[PDB]
Symmetry: C3
Subunit: 142 residues, 3 copies
Amino acid sequence: LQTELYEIKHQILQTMGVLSLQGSMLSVGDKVFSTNGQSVNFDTIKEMCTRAGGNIAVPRTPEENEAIASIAKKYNNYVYLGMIDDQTEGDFHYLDGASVSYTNWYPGEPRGQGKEDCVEMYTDGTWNDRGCLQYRLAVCEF
Amino acid sequence: LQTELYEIKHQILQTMGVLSLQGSMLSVGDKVFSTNGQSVNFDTIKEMCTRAGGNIAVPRTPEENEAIASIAKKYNNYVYLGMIDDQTEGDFHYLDGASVSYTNWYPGEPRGQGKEDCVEMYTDGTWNDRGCLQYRLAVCEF
Amino acid sequence: LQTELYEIKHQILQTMGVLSLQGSMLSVGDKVFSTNGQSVNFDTIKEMCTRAGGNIAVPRTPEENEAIASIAKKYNNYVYLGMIDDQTEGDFHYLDGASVSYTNWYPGEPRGQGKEDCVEMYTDGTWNDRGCLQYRLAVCEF
Ligand SMILES: OC[C@H]1O[C@H](O)[C@@H](O)[C@@H](O)[C@@H]1O
Ligand SMILES: OC[C@H]1O[C@H](O)[C@@H](O)[C@@H](O)[C@@H]1O
Ligand SMILES: OC[C@H]1O[C@H](O)[C@@H](O)[C@@H](O)[C@@H]1O
Ligand SMILES: OC[C@H]1O[C@H](O)[C@@H](O)[C@@H](O)[C@@H]1O
Ligand SMILES: OC[C@H]1O[C@H](O)[C@@H](O)[C@@H](O)[C@@H]1O
Ligand SMILES: OC[C@H]1O[C@H](O)[C@@H](O)[C@@H](O)[C@@H]1O
Ligand SMILES: OC[C@H]1O[C@H](O)[C@@H](O)[C@@H](O)[C@@H]1O
Ligand SMILES: OC[C@H]1O[C@H](O)[C@@H](O)[C@@H](O)[C@@H]1O
Ligand SMILES: OC[C@H]1O[C@H](O)[C@@H](O)[C@@H](O)[C@@H]1O
Ligand SMILES: [Ca+2]
Ligand SMILES: [Ca+2]
Ligand SMILES: [Ca+2]
Ligand SMILES: [Ca+2]
Ligand SMILES: [Ca+2]
Ligand SMILES: [Ca+2]
């Protein structure tokens, strides 16, 4: 049994290692981030991620934020994050409805507020509330 | 133990998710389809797939058929499938020798019959019996 | 439980199979080799591999040697291997400090010895002791 489990863990390490080495994904602790390289709107990203068995990425620690930023930098595009203020403005929540804890707003944001329901990450890793219809790099977490 | 198994299942989900997201493979239920993008004959495809620990793909449900068709469409080439009528014509079997159940013949096929031992999938997902020496997209199942 | 373990092993086979089929990695027995395609010096390769959860590759059997050689051939570059003679010349050890067993020196090597601390693999799979500051294909094992 333990030899079976050793084998299994080893093979998982190998597959993860190859995907990491080749830049196919980025792991931060127990979270994996990845992109298909496409730039599409918020609803399309959500669909793309859930179809792959994941979720549109959202950073909950500085180290997670920096990993997503590095992907934004690599593709030179902003990234939509997994949070919205669709109910009442300024009140951002994760897509499961929980209130946001970690934030990294660009100085002065969130503002501009007509309806800026979504959040985009600039390539320096800071955040801007934005409408949800822009074409942004699809980044998923697993 | 259960935490160990939770960890293992999570990591498998992550690696599968990254491969899916990036278009490296397509999963239909418990079956995974993938291509190396090469176009080669039937015997070479078989070798290529078994070397990777899989088998030349064969659809057994409409949903499996559509996944392989989508790969054929993406690469704009026909796909050899894992079935033959090498013994007596019109009598198609899977490579393990079992009689074929699900079929999706293009209207009028199978015909043309000299020796058309193999089966190719057109890019609309329908099938044609064909000789085995053509260059066709290598699609494997795992 | 056994169905759970069957599922897990199957999915691992699928992910390994896709990575193999697509040329992302090469498996020899229980060892996986892979490259990010970059050419950098010895210290950088070590870092690159350990960051991915692996180690700079070193062949310990003829079959492992041939797999790394095939990657060197594919990228038309020499490969730094995971061994050094930094202590006293001619005395090569793996990075964990164990004495080297399997070798495949090009005829006449190791020689040229000023300080040739590292080992590079030529594209025919044979070895040359070399300084560690050259740009060589990064090949990792997992
Ligand atoms: O702007 C449209 C956009 O606004 C809403 O707040 C959200 O539910 C999004 O899912 C939707 O796509
Ligand atoms: O699991 C759902 C959860 O997944 C990710 O973390 C993000 O998309 C969140 O906004 C969402 O609440
Ligand atoms: O420059 C800040 C301001 O710029 C634009 O108007 C929009 O992208 C806003 O979301 C943002 O707040
Ligand atoms: O045409 C040659 C072809 O014909 C036979 O029926 C099959 O066994 C194939 O494996 C073989 O490659
Ligand atoms: O496992 C063997 C089996 O694998 C795949 O489904 C196909 O190649 C079949 O034709 C073959 O019988
Ligand atoms: O067009 C139908 C007919 O076309 C060609 O002759 C061949 O590809 C046959 O296998 C096929 O049946
Ligand atoms: O030439 C520099 C080189 O020489 C030493 O022997 C080794 O420890 C290497 O790690 C180092 O990079
Ligand atoms: O696990 C450490 C071990 O990993 C690989 O096999 C090589 O880099 C060796 O030189 C090293 O001793
Ligand atoms: O040709 C053999 C000789 O060539 C060069 O001088 C260097 O690469 C040496 O490491 C090697 O031994
Ligand atoms: Ca707002
Ligand atoms: Ca704003
Ligand atoms: Ca026929
Ligand atoms: Ca025909
Ligand atoms: Ca030497
Ligand atoms: Ca030398």
